[PDB]
Assembly symmetry: D2
Homo-oligomer: 327 residues x 4
């Protein structure tokens, strides 16, 4: 049995005696992600560069990748009839779905993450988290302000050497490779579980001067292991989706701690940190800010940042025991 | 007008009043890079997973990506009738072309580079360097022991968010985007030059304990600038092709020095360091061991390794200055 | 609202307060049809012709298109958990789905129709009809012996200049174009209705010598209109799916009447005639054998043939009034 | 070895000790045919239908397939710098290349042929015929009024179940399959020859009332063979490119004679009849008006029409014999 993601979600829904909305919702995301992937890989770029004389559409229009990505997600998500509140990294306000198309899901998303890496063609991705609305009020921003602990599903699509969609739900984590030949996601790793302990550490050490004593100490340990074991390898792609995906698949740890330009860290809680934390923990990993569990923070700003440290349970706890020691 | 690599290469050939072997070799490489790209993006992977039954080999009998890539490159290059000796990272010995397919060119390639990043879907790529044969005598592995300085052409294909072929010839570096919808590389940047000074450093800091004192000092400057300027950001994909390309386009520096565990460095002179060193110098940047230009090393072994430091000229110059100050 | 076929079927199922099986079933067919289309358009054919030296799979294997098509459908259909009996044109016996994977639907199909046209690259297609099982007995052949009047859904995918999936159900007929860039079928014509009267007639007139008086007379009329109107244009592609699709879209009429090599006509009732008749009639057209309604014939052999005349209501009735006149 | 059209064309050029303009023109055509093929198969059609919002023009402002095709062909051909005069079915007047892009070649093309079949998804295609300029004098429309006999190259791309480019040059006809996964046409049949005698006839019998007595008699022979052999099958896609290709590969005959409503026939001499006549004769078949070779007509108008009868030599010879018997 080849498992497609379309089959997988539908079977999931039929297990849960669902109304379907979530199936429709996840089918929408899949469509959006294939469309984003096709654009990310620059399909049709000959037309931008004049293969048919320009002409074509009459008056100036063209989109950056990030704008298209955002358009696809929002339109695809609305079309689902499964959502009521959308939080995109690109919209300073929560988007409230028009009643006609209103469903019960709230969706926080980064349509295209890793923007520093777009122009150099490095891996970038799409990140999403989904809540059920838990109010009877008019859907509004407040419905997106839930701790990540309430996520019913989250994951990301990585547009890398190949395109992979990682979906996490209450039961666990599954990876589906996009076969772009047939536009189908194929389950290739069922019930993914991160190694307890890794040998890779991923952080932007350019901020060394701004790190707290606890990060600084952990980093020296990765380099000069006190047990005089082999030092960890370093990897930082610079696109959270690639770096997090490699953490998931090879183990190790990823850090975006606080530093002065952000004391609250850089990464956004609702649509960067939370969905990654939910995937990590569903895979048997950890995601802490250094002081508290990421998924337990009750947000009060849909764009608030959080520091995040995530990955293998014994790497992350080793760091957390360092914070615990210094405090 | 839109410029395709096929047209470009062909005009370059016509200008030259060459015989056309170079042209045939490069159309060859293009065809191979597109065929590696489609396989890297995992097209038709659903057949591997049983979409059409025939379900026994969900394990490893079917070709790894590196073996397929190597086959594609060796085979396409042989059929161009333009080469006589080939050096692949994947074969212990130089391959000598059967006389019937013998051209005048020598090709040193890494069919898929970035192997540690293959399982996690991070960017990977293809690196080639092309020599004219110097000798009259029967072609042999010695024919490929020429300093990169003697390169007639070199470049790489990056299979990243999109696929890009970067080609550097005598008169400069050009970047061609692959539009996979029509199987055509489009000139997107012409006469590429790296910027004088970057703000990014790329090196695997996990080897901190093994770095010589100049690498050590230089890294300290990137994090704690003595003159109090902004610290450099850090980036390290873990795939030379991705980190190089990011250096070309955004500026900064890429480092893989010798370390006490690897004394002569890790990266292979003929089909990793030279081609990239050549690209870099053609783009106004530098590529050094820390003591001598990379392109000036006289290779004594086709699998010889070399330390390499490359990128913006002011950044590489600064570390060169550190090495001379350390004697 | 862009409508994908995945969304459309799911919304259909959620309207009908379904268990899902039919949604899972139609999602399976979609996947099969994209995979068939990708193969039909010869994606990967470079490998057949040695781009990477052969090698690849070790010992002889390769499939004809028709064999692959059949494999895809059967495996995809079984995987659905929605079927119990499958009738393929390629299997001399009905296929009884193993209990583990048994669903309640019976599916009759031509995985690849128009075989005379494959080697010359003309349009070919896939044809399907679906019944609910209407017995409590062990699923068996007899469950596939239902008149087409009991179909819950039928249609075809045409692999032509583009790939289109035409789905007919109790409510009517919808056309979805395959956008092979994202592997999604896009609803492009809702609730399709055939013109009452066409101006095209499609038949293999090479059998003129064997036609009954009624076909012969109608044909002379198409050529020499008794009202001295412009004669009908003639089109016969030779692949029922193309010819029928053009009948549906432009109107007119298609005939595969009885002749000596077949007195019962050539086309197979269960998986050629019936699904096409169901589409035609759902679009406001007709499908007769010349004497009786195609969809009312109770089959007794899963491979039995029927003569078929179909298309615009006034063309078909004009022919039927000719049969009525001669009898 | 695998032979790509790019390699083939390039070797053909090298052999010739040509300047390379022919080579550049044909790489040009290849690039255009792949770009028409991808658009014909409807890639990215979901953007036209609102997948990313921007929903106003679901009507006709965006480019018809024929206009896009024409733009692609004119533009790509101009940029090859190998042509001086172009004749497109879509432009009333010959197009004269601006001096800066002037080569030595004259191209007569039908960018998309098969227009009546475009809406129903039946096969369609691209037909080109390439002349050397005969004159010294400023290029003009007269430069394209040369008998097909003077053709240096001609062929067609069929966008059928798969896309195939058929190219006929002085030394014969070769068929190249497009593998759209890597954007590469693969030589699949070399030195193609049509069979002596076929069993298929292709003609639009709707004009029966307008056919001269020789066409009339010949058709009667196909259906009721005087010598009691098996009647010919009939086939008529309605797209010259598809019906021709089927004639090339399976043998038989294709007919578009003059009829009283169209006295000089329907098909255009320069960019429908000639190129196909040339292909046919290069493959050992014939192409006649019924009274003279098609390739020997001296065109007096770039949009001149001509009756054409083509295919297996014995089949065409037999109808020629009928015409001479009718005076
Ligand atoms: O350049 P920095 O500070 O290392 O930030 C990189 C981070 O920025 C982001 O693009 C912001 O989302 C993340 O993908 C990534 O991890
Ligand atoms: O794990 P490390 O030592 O940092 O290796 C990274 C290097 O490994 C390689 O894959 C070796 O070829 C390069 O692509 C890359 O630069
Ligand atoms: O060659 P003939 O007798 O005209 O038969 C053509 C018919 O054969 C089939 O391939 C048999 O399915 C149909 O697609 C088509 O209509
Ligand atoms: O409807 P008719 O007259 O049979 O026309 C068919 C001919 O029309 C054309 O489209 C005219 O270009 C050809 O492709 C085809 O052979
Ligand atoms: Mg973003
Ligand atoms: Mg982001
Ligand atoms: Mg390698
Ligand atoms: Mg390598
Ligand atoms: Mg079949
Ligand atoms: Mg059939
Ligand atoms: Mg045309
Ligand atoms: Mg035409």
């Amino acid at each position: 049995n080849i498992v497609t993601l379309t089959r997988f979600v539908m079977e999931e829904g039929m297990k849960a005696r669902g109304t379907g909305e979530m199936t429709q919702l996840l089918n929408s995301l899949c469509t959006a992600v294939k469309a984003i992937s096709t654009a990310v890989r620059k399909a049709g770029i000959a037309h931008l560069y004049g293969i048919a004389g320009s002409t074509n559409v009459t008056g100036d229009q063209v989109k950056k990748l990030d704008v298209l990505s955002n358009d696809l997600v929002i339109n695809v998500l609305k079309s689902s009839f499964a959502t009521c509140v959308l939080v995109s990294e690109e919209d300073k306000n929560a988007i409230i779905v028009e009643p006609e198309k209103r469903g019960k899901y709230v969706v926080c998303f980064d349509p295209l993450d890793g923007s520093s890496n777009i122009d150099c063609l490095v891996s970038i991705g799409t990140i999403f988290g989904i809540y059920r609305k838990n109010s009877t009020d008019e859907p509004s921003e407040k419905d997106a302000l839930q701790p990540g602990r309430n996520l019913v599903a989250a994951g990301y699509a990585l547009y890398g050497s190949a395109t992979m969609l990682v979906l996490a739900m209450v039961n666990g984590v599954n990876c589906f490779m996009l076969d772009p030949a047939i536009g189908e996601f194929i389950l290739v790793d069922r019930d993914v579980k991160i190694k307890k302990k890794g040998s890779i550490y991923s952080i932007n050490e350019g901020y060394a001067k701004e790190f707290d004593p606890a990060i600084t100490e952990y980093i020296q340990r990765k380099k000069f292991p006190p047990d005089n074991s082999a030092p960890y390898g370093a990897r930082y792609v610079g696109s959270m989706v690639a770096d997090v995906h490699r953490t998931l698949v090879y183990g190790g740890i990823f850090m975006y701690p606080a530093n002065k330009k952000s004391p609250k860290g850089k990464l956004r809680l609702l649509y960067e940190c939370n969905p990654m934390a939910y995937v990590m923990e569903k895979a048997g990993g950890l995601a802490t800010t250094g002081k508290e569990a990421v998924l337990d923070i009750v947000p009060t700003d849909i764009h608030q940042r959080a520091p995040i440290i995530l990955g293998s349970p014994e790497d992350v706890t080793e760091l957390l025991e360092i914070y615990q020691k210094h405090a």
